[PDB]
């Protein structure tokens, strides 16, 4: 039973990767683009971009292990461990040619180790709205002169004593609605219907727990990225970020310049953290343009 | 009903102050010293210090407005507004002579405005284990290489949409256990019974809400203190801080040097954030010695 409506011309399928049953939605013809979603969402965040990319590409959008309809990882939740599943999934559909990668939110955390380790496999790279896990995240403030910061959840989710699961169980929709809307500039695109779809999905107990394990593994990911980042990224890369309340602002491009040689960036005015939902028309335009040159 | 046991030789009483019924515990003879508790506790956190100070002073330990057995404030929850209530209460018992002040945790937030506005009314000052609200708190990190920071609750409690009450109500015993133990170096002093008593007091609905309004007023308190801090503090002052997991460390005395000219500081090794409970023997000695000189 699908958790979200599949777009016309696309198929919802499963594929075993290192013993893990992964869910993905696939469509189109041509070179492969893999779209990797982030926290609080599923593959479905890409459902407006997918039918547009499918005119020129083979598009695959998987659910991260443990989220959506993908089984939890069997190894762990650090970026290096999750990257194995996403790399092997993609190479099963593009084993002979490099493929393109679009990632958002913790989709970046779970792909950067694969990108850096298999650079010949990645033709072009689009990263949007998330820091690569490294020492900079230790400088985000807990509290601001504007009020609640948008990053206090790092500690909330990573806390021991099962703090997040216990506090959110029975209040998943309420928490997720506050979490999404407080990181958004355009709140009206988050309908009550859409919020319920996402809420139901991540309220599955193994999905609620998997969600927090990513943040619980963040310190491990930072140590991993410290070694990997000694190799800079050589493929063409583009960063997208929102310039409104809740967006990453100039941070996105600035951090990426330390990782990539060939990077161009855009900051979208009036957009928050959820670019595919908040600013679909501009964001889709930039992505389709970048992947088509 | 009393919420906590009164030390033998002390009285639990109430007193109306600007239309708000405040609860306090009073005992002893001599000059007045006021002990002001912080979040997650009540007047009862002073119950070990109280019988010793009472041999030389008249000791009053109130419940902050809205917490313990005190009615909520009628004005607001910023430091300036709450400091009005504590000042008049103290002036009611020492209208002719200055008094002494010991404050802890958000007890500092709710007295500093009174101290700076009525320096003549305060003979000696002891501040322990809390920042004075100013821009420095905007620099505490949201997340650390050690895991969850101890200050992300600033944003959690401050969040709109009644996020903290909605998630915590009915789970006070679980949440308070984690909150206190994660800020303590000595957790075993928080017996199952003491956590039950505090959780019962904070599960009164108006008290859970009052708790978070202090944090929701914190930005106002910072703006208030920026003007107030133009007058340095004249009286003798002492800072106490824990040097173990969860203590303020060197920050307590360092920040106080920007507010006070006559300040001595102590960092208690092996002690976390709840000094009156975690390190009663060393802490009481320093307070008794400082207040008796």
């Amino acid at each position, epitope marked *: 039973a699908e958790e979200f409506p599949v777009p016309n011309g696309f198929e919802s399928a499963y594929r075993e990767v290192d013993g893990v049953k992964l869910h993905y939605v696939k469509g189109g013809q041509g070179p492969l683009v893999m779209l990797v979603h982030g926290f609080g969402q599923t593959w479905y965040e890409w459902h407006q971009l997918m039918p547009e990319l499918a005119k020129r590409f083979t598009v695959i959008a998987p659910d991260l292990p443990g989220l959506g309809q993908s089984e939890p990882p069997k190894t762990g939740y650090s970026g290096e461990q999750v990257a194995v599943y996403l790399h092997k999934l993609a190479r099963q559909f593009s084993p002979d040619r490099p493929f393109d990668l679009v990632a958002h939110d913790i989709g970046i955390w779970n792909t950067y180790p694969m990108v850096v380790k298999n650079q010949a496999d990645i033709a072009r790279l689009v990263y949007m*709205e998330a820091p690569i896990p490294d020492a900079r995240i230790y400088r985000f403030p807990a509290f601001t002169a*504007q009020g609640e910061s948008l990053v206090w959840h790092f500690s909330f989710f990573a806390a021991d004593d099962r703090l997040a699961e216990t506090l959110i169980a029975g209040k998943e929709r309420f928490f997720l609605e506050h979490f999404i809307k407080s990181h958004a500039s355009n709140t009206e695109v988050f309908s009550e219907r859409l919020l319920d779809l996402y809420a139901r999905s991540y309220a599955k107990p193994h999905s609620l727990n998997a969600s927090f394990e990513y943040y619980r593994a963040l310190n491990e990911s930072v140590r991993q990225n410290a070694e990997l980042a000694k190799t800079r990224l050589q493929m063409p890369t583009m960063t997208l970020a929102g310039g409104g309340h809740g967006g990453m602002g100039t941070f996105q491009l600035e951090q990426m310049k330390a990782y990539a040689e060939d990077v161009e960036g855009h900051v979208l005015p009036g957009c928050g953290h959820w670019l595919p939902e908040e600013c679909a028309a501009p964001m889709n335009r930039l992505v389709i343009d970048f992947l088509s040159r | 009903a009393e919420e906590f046991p009164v030390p033998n030789g002390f009285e639990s009483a109430y007193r109306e102050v600007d239309g708000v019924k405040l609860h306090y515990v009073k005992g002893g003879q001599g000059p007045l010293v006021m002990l002001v508790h912080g979040f997650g506790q009540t007047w009862y956190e002073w119950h070990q210090l109280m019988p010793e100070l009472a041999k030389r002073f008249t000791v009053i330990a109130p419940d902050l407005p809205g917490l313990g057995q005190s009615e909520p404030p009628k004005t607001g929850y910023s430091g300036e507004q709450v400091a009005v209530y504590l000042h008049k209460l103290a002036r009611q018992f020492s209208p002719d002579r200055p008094f002494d002040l010991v404050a802890h945790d958000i007890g500092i937030w709710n007295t500093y405005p009174m101290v700076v506005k009525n320096q003549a009314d305060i003979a000696r000052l002891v501040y322990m284990e809390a920042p004075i609200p100013d821009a420095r708190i905007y620099r505490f990190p949201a997340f650390t290489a050690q895991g969850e920071s101890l200050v992300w609750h600033f944003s959690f409690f401050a969040a709109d949409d009644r996020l903290a009450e909605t998630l915590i109500a009915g789970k006070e015993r679980f949440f308070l256990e984690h909150f206190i133990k994660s800020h303590a170096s000595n957790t075993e002093v928080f017996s199952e019974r003491l956590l039950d008593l505090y959780a019962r007091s904070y599960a009164k609905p108006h008290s859970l809400n009052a708790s978070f309004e202090y944090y929701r007023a914190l930005n106002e308190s910072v703006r208030q203190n920026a003007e107030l801090a133009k007058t340095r503090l004249q009286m003798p002052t002492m800072t106490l801080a824990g040097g173990g997991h969860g203590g303020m460390g060197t920050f307590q005395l360092e920040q106080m040097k920007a507010y006070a000219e006559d300040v001595e500081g102590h960092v208690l090794p092996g002690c976390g954030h709840w000094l009156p409970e975690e390190c009663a023997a060393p802490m009481n000695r320093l307070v008794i010695d400082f207040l008796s000189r």
Partner: nanobody
Amino acid sequence: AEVQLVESGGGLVQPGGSLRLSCTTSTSLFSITTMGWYRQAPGKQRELVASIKRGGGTNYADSMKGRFTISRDNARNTVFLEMNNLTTEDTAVYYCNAAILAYTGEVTNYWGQGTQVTVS
């Protein structure tokens, strides 16, 4: 710059009189964490008059409620400052501010062009 602010209003008013200041944003007001009015008198510091958070919460600096009222019009992306019962002490240059909180906790400020209000 992510956001452009276009202020208008101001001028010379008699004591007791009234004025309305305006500021328009190039982006939606819900994309801006806080909108604010600040003023600066000759030889003095720029001080807060009033704020309105994107969720609608208002904040006044001490002793400003009485003379000022902040409001917005989300359809026109415009924030307003209504000045009532003005006095000589209200003579100042009045500025509009847009503060944006980024995901990282960084705050960016954008300012409108100052406008002179003289009470005489």
